[PDB]
């Protein structure tokens, strides 16, 4: 076929690879960033739910 | 990291009942219903205010 096919097709190949390349570099940075700060959706290590708290009055006022 | 604020001993010199345990127990039923209003006020303070120093009065 014409060289136009290979030229345009390879341009798409470069476009796809570039976006993939920069995303991985972003992914390693974000993964490092949100692991440390922790204010992110994932890496949210488990805690204890506040629902399991007995708010009923106890037998001792000092509670 | 602060002051554990404690009331002075002046306000603690309140008249205390001087009766043996059996005296309280014998008249306990005839004491609870007839002095409920201040008793409930104090113990409401104990559970609500949650601090001993608040319910001194």
Automatic annotation (TrEMBL), chain A:
Sorted keywords for this record are: Coiled coil, Electron transport, Membrane, Mitochondrion, Mitochondrion inner membrane, Respiratory chain, Transit peptide, Transmembrane, Transmembrane helix, Transport, Ubiquinone
| Cellular component, GO annotation | mitochondrial inner membrane; nucleoplasm; respiratory chain complex I
Which domain of life, per UniProt?
A: Eukaryota
- Principal localisation: mitochondrion
Coiled-coil intervals, chain numbering: 4-36
Where does it reside? Mitochondrion inner membrane
Q: Main role?
A: Accessory subunit of the mitochondrial membrane respiratory chain NADH dehydrogenase (Complex I), that is believed not to be involved in catalysis. Complex I functions in the transfer of electrons from NADH to the respiratory chain. The immediate electron acceptor for the enzyme is believed to be ubiquinone.
Instruction: Please give the subunit comment from the record.
Output: Complex I is composed of 45 different subunits.
Report the family membership.
Belongs to the complex I NDUFB5 subunit family.
Instruction: Write down what this protein is called.
Output: NADH dehydrogenase [ubiquinone] 1 beta subcomplex subunit 5, mitochondrial
Instruction: Please report the organism this UniProt entry assigns to the protein.
Output: Sus scrofa
Q: What is the lineage of its organism?
A: Eukaryota, Metazoa, Chordata, Craniata, Vertebrata
TrEMBL record, chain B:
What is the first-listed, main subcellular location in coarse terms?
mitochondrion
Coiled-coil parts of chain: none
Keyword field? Disulfide bond, Electron transport, Mitochondrion, Repeat, Respiratory chain, Transport
Which subcellular locations apply to this protein?
A: Mitochondrion intermembrane space
Q: Does the keyword Transport apply?
A: yes
Q: Which GO terms describe its cellular component?
A: mitochondrial intermembrane space
Give all cystine bridges in this chain: 45-55
Question: Highest taxon of the source?
Answer: Eukaryota
Biological process (GO) annotations held by this record are: mitochondrial electron transport, NADH to ubiquinone
What is the stated purpose of this protein? Answer: Accessory subunit of the mitochondrial membrane respiratory chain NADH dehydrogenase (Complex I), that is believed not to be involved in catalysis. Complex I functions in the transfer of electrons from NADH to the respiratory chain. The immediate electron acceptor for the enzyme is believed to be ubiquinone.
Tell me its family: Belongs to the complex I NDUFA8 subunit family.
Subunit (UniProt): Complex I is composed of 45 different subunits.
What protein name is recorded for this chain?
NADH dehydrogenase [ubiquinone] 1 alpha subcomplex subunit 8
Upper lineage? Eukaryota, Metazoa, Chordata, Craniata, Vertebrata
| Parent-protein residues present | 78 to 134 of 248
């Amino acid at each position: 076929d014409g060289p136009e096919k290979n030229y345009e097709k390879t341009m798409a190949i470069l476009q796809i690879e570039a976006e993939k390349a920069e995303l991985r570099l972003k992914e390693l940075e974000v993964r490092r960033l949100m692991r440390a700060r922790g204010d992110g959706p994932w890496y949210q290590y488990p805690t204890i739910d506040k629902a399991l708290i007995d708010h009923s009055p106890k037998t001792t006022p000092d509670n | 990291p602060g002051i554990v604020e404690l009331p002075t001993l002046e306000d603690l010199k309140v008249q205390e009942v001087k009766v043996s345990s059996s005296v309280l127990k014998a008249a306990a039923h005839h004491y609870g219903a007839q002095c409920d209003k201040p008793n409930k006020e104090f113990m409401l303070c104990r559970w609500e205010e949650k601090d001993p120093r608040r319910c001194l009065e």
